[PDB]
Amino acid sequence: HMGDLKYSLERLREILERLEENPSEKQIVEAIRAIVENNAQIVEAIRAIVENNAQIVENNRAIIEALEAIGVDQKILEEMKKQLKDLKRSL
Amino acid sequence: MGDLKYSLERLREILERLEENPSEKQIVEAIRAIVENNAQIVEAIRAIVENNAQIVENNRAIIEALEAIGVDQKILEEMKKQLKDLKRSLE
Amino acid sequence: HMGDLKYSLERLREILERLEENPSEKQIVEAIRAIVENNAQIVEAIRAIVENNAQIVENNRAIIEALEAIGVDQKILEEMKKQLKDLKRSLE
Amino acid sequence: HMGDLKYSLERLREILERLEENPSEKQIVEAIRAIVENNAQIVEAIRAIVENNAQIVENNRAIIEALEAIGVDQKILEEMKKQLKDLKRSL
Amino acid sequence: MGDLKYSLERLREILERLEENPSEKQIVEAIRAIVENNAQIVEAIRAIVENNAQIVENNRAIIEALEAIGVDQKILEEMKKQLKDLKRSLE
Amino acid sequence: HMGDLKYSLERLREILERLEENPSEKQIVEAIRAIVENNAQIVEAIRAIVENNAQIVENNRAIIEALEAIGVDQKILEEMKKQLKDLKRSLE
Q1: What stretch of H or E contains B50?
Q2: Half-sphere exposure at residue E65, Cβ-oriented, CA atoms within 13 angstroms
Q3: CA C83, CA C87: separation in Å to the nearest integer?
Q4: What is the three-class DSSP state of E70?
Q5: DSSP of C25-67
Q6: Vertex D71, ends D69 and D77: CA angle to 5°?
Q7: How far is C51 from C58, CA to CA, in rounded Å?
Q8: Which of D59, A5, E80, D23 is nearest to F33 (CA)?
Q9: Among B20, D63, B13, which residue's Cα sits nearest to residue F57?
């Protein structure tokens, strides 16, 4: 959409220079039509950005779940410590 | 986002009404609608920027945790010498 | 910039009041010019948000690449497990 | 057992000096009895060492199992990479 | 270990036989049995030492893996600057 | 030492042949002396194996202490998860 944004805006500026040269009701209306079409594209882009942000957060969420599991669980960790307590006793 | 989609719907309706019976009253009406739509675009953008800021700080915490996921070089240093010791007595 | 956004919008509202107070072709055109200038700044702010999102995704990509290497390589794991097997055989 | 070893051996050396002073069939037999009792204790100690070694290997085995799980599984890891491929595409 | 327990059983039997009807033939017999028991103690010890050597080398591999379990300081260095970058553009 | 073991045993076998060849009270006593000397070296070798086992257990103890800290502290994990929650709330 960033392409349509750049050009939807370039189109907009052309009409504006035009409008400022030969102001008329038709040119004003034409300029407003162009504005509306540019806002429609701004809205579309924003809707996409907000969607990208949502996916980013889901990826970040998965990253934390991974971090959550990187350690050694306290169930096996507890097993090894007792094993060591035992060995130290016998020894 | 909800407000955006509708302030854009409201904007498109005036535009065709303007294009139907154009008048100074309608042009001004349409401009007021544009301004209201732009103010809502601006709020959305500000929210997106706030979300980006919070996203970047979460990424920072993720990296802080990655830094600490390994085993300390102090503790790792003690074990190697322990190993060095053993391998000497043993031989 | 977020500031230039805030003010190209405040400027825009000022003209709109003027326009509604004393409507005229000159004021209408002036309001349209202000609109285009505000749209230009909306577009630039959007352009930067898209830039920032791409860098964020790149950073996320590095984070995952680091998570992939946090484990112990399966070449060392393979060697240790074999050692454990041999030991268990000799001791028994 | 290391205590009984040290003293079972000290006892042994006493008889030996004794034996070497007044050699006799009774002292020889007495010395052999002492030897046998010392070997019995050496065997007991060895049996314990071999048991300690067995427990050590079991602990080492658990340590490797832990190392085996410290990473992030290739099932979630695969999920995040696709999530990123998706994001990169849309974006 | 099996051989140990029995060369010790064999040794104890001669001892009581020696103590029953002591003779130079029996004393020499008992000494031969002792020597055979000691040779078997020595083999056991040598095996235990071999096991200790293999144990120590497994521990070395365990520590080598612990060293590599973290995230490289090179990769970790790249991400922080990435974060530094973002936080600058963003603000 | 493992070497002094090997040789106090070879020495021991030599006397035993002598003893069996020409038995005598002097040779018997001499064989017993050799035995005690071999037992003394068995005991020392055992004493070192017990020493080495204790250091091995100590090293194993450090390895487990390092495994306990390989995870990400639950204080950082707590903070990140909260951040994720807030973000999900603002974005929605």
Answers
A1: helix B24-68
A2: 29
A3: 6
A4: coil
A5: HHHHHHHHHHHHHHHHHHHHHHHHHHHHHHHHHHHHHHHHHHH
A6: 120
A7: 11
A8: D23
A9: D63
In 3D, which of F50, E59, D28 has the Cα closest to residue B87? E59
Chain B nearest C-alpha distance from E34 (Å): 28
How many residue contacts between C and E have a Cβ separation below 8 Å? 63
The residue type found at E8 is L
Please choose, from the candidates F36, F33, F9, the residue with its C-alpha nearest in 3D space to the C-alpha of residue E45.
F9
How many CA atoms, within 13 angstroms, populate the side-chain half-sphere of residue E28? 16
**Which chain B positions have a beta carbon within 8 Å of E53's beta carbon?**
90
Tokens describing residue A34: 């162009």
d(CA B48, CA B73): 41
The reply to whether residue D60 touches residue E65, judged by beta carbons under 8 angstroms, is: no
Whole-angstrom CA distances from D46 to A25, B31, B80, E42 are 108, 97, 28, 10
Contact D50 E52 (CB under 8 A): no
Counting the structural domains of chain F, the total is 1
State how far the Cα of D35 lies from the Cα of E89, in Å rounded to an integer: 85
* Strand, coil or helix: F73: coil
Which whole-number Å values give the CA distances from E89 to B90, D71, F62, F66, in the listed order?
A: 59, 34, 45, 39
Nearest to A52 by CA among F12, C49, E66: C49
Chains B and C form CB pairs within 8 A to the count of: 62
State which residues form the domain around A31. 2-90
| Closest chain B residue to the Cα of E80, Cα to Cα | B63
- Residue A81 has which token pair? 């410590």
The nearest CA of chain C is from the CA of D70 a distance in Å of 6
Report in angstroms the alpha-carbon separations of E87 from A37, B57, C49: 33, 9, 13
DSSP D70: S
CA distance B65 to E71: 10
Task: Read off the tokens for A27.
Answer: 């040119």
Q: How far apart are CA B63 and CA B81, in angstroms?
A: 30
Among chain A residues, CA nearest to D54:
A87
Nearest to F49 by CA among D11, B76, D5: D5
- Give the distance from residue B38's alpha carbon to the nearest chain E alpha carbon, in angstroms: 22
Q: Which of E1, B4, D70, B58 is nearest to F84 (CA)?
A: B58
**Considering only CB atoms, which chain E residues are within 8 Å of B58?**
none
Q: Do F70 and B71 contact (CB within 8 A), yes or no? A: yes
Position C82: which residue type? Answer: K
To the nearest whole Å, the CA of F21 is away from the closest chain A CA by: 45
Residues in chain D: 91
Which chain C residues have a beta carbon less than 8 Å from that of A56?
53, 56-57, 60
Q: Which amino acid is at E60?
A: R
d(CA D71, CA D66): 10
